[PDB]
Design a protein around this ligand. Structure first.
Ligand SMILES: CNCC(=O)c1nnc(C(C)(C)C)o1
Length: 313
């Protein structure tokens, strides 16, 4: 099974001012002359990690990675002002011009696949190929499954904790209920809800439980992760339609793509990958048996490495 390339430092980085109150962190890694690529992290509000650099051949790829508005090293931290899908799409173009790339490969998993599609459908001309994982299209059915009733039936003992702070009436709409707490004037109230919401996801993203899931509880990370995720979901990803992303696939069918999705991905159901593949015949679909949601699930990682090497030779 293929694994990550060895660790390496970014050869350059900085902060880009959006002009509307955001200074977003970015970093360039790999080969300054290599094939251009951009990494879209998940969440939203997930942030990048040094390991994401190791997802591409160090000598064949010029990888630009960045923290989306409000998370990671991007300032202001946990900010919900001017934080929408369309601003992020704008930011990607901005970052593209700066790095001086004419066209690049878009790599994105989970929310990253969502923003990748929105971006690709908005600027088809700028995408050479796409490597998508754990498809998430933001349909209400997708949000209901993960935050109202669905995954809850596979992890009832964990879902009981998420509901613990809610009154019986609030339980009918968990997203809305958490939205109030996450936007409370009391930071202690915000953090309590933020931790619960983040750990729920941290513990259901892998096939088997891992200690790693506890890092989703760190105050600063949890706070921005929850606020931003909940923000985007509260507004249905800022899409015109429930199925806008599937409805506009015609605009990118001509683009080479690979779709990797764990059979037992509990955050995003395989159904999403199947629906996408049905509308996108050209795309190469890979349903990884025995795998969960996370990019580092042995079987999912294997297909991603093979996918990136393939597009680079
Ligand atoms: C509903 N939130 C799922 C999501 O977009 C997400 N959370 N973590 C990830 C990565 C696997 C990309 C780290 O994606």
């Amino acid at each position: 099974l293929r694994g990550l390339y060895p660790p390496l430092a970014a050869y350059d980085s900085g902060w880009l001012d959006t002009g509307d109150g955001h200074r977003i962190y970015w970093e360039l890694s790999g080969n300054p002359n290599g094939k251009p690529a951009v990494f879209i992290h998940g969440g939203p509000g997930g942030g990048i990690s040094p390991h994401h650099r190791q997802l591409f051949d160090p000598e064949r790829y010029k990888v630009l990675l960045f923290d989306q508005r409000g998370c990671g090293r991007s300032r202001p931290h946990a900010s919900l002002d001017n934080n929408t899908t369309w601003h992020l799409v704008a930011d990607i173009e901005r970052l593209r011009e700066m790095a001086g790339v004419e066209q690049w490969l878009v790599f994105g998993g989970s929310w990253g696949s969502t923003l990748a599609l929105a971006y690709a459908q908005t600027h088809p001309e700028r995408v050479s190929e796409m490597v998508l994982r754990g498809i998430f299209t933001l349909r209400k059915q997708r949000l209901h499954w993960y935050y109202q009733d669905g995954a809850s039936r596979f992890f009832p003992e964990k879902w009981e904790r998420v509901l613990s702070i809610l009154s019986d009436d609030e339980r009918k709409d968990v997203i809305a209920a958490y939205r109030q707490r996450l936007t409370s004037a009391d930071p202690q109230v915000q953090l309590e809800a933020a931790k619960l919401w983040s750990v729920w996801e941290g513990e259901t993203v892998t096939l088997l439980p891992s200690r790693e899931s506890a890092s989703f509880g760190e105050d600063d990370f949890a706070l921005a992760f929850a606020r931003i995720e909940n923000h985007y979901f509260t507004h249905l990803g800022f899409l015109e339609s429930d199925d806008q992303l599937l409805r506009n696939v015609p605009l990118i069918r001509h683009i080479p793509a690979v779709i990797v999705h764990g059979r037992y991905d509990m955050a995003c159901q395989v159904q999403n990958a199947w629906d996408l593949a049905k509308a996108w015949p050209e795309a190469e679909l890979h349903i990884v048996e025995g795998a969960g949601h996370s990019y580092d699930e042995p079987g999912i990682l294997h297909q991603l490495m093979i996918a990136t090497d393939r597009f680079a030779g």
